[PDB]
Amino acid sequence: LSVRFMGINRNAIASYLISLYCSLAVLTDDALAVLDDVEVDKYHDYPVNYK
Amino acid sequence: LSVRFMGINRNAIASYLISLYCSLAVLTDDALAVLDDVEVDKYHDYPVNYK
């Protein structure tokens, strides 16, 4: 990450440039797996019998 | 007072920002008085009697 001064405009406003450089690499295919179609809105109805 | 370099434009002209911050406070009312309607254009005609 880097921060650089760019200058002051005629409205007396100073500008700063912020930049972050990055990337991602997967060296072998078997290092990553994904499970799809996961449903998160289902709740179980359990029978009850109270004293 | 502060002076700051703003940058050089494409006409080879450099810009400098100069700013001065100040204020005034009167702690108590009786510390200040003003006299108005002062006339400054009136001259007295003095009688003369020369030898």
- The answer to whether the CB atoms of B17 and A9 lie below 8 A apart is no
Residues of A in contact with B7 (CB under 8 A): 7-8
Rounded-to-integer distance, Cα B8 and Cα B14, Å: 4
Cβ neighbours around B7 below 10 Å, total? 14
Reported resolution in A?
1.8
Q: Are A37 and A46 in contact (CB under 8 A)?
A: no
How far B25 CA sits from the closest chain A CA (Å)? 27
B42: left (phi over 0), alpha (psi -120 to 50) or beta: beta
- Technique used to solve these coordinates: cryo-EM
B10 touches chain A (CB under 8 A): no
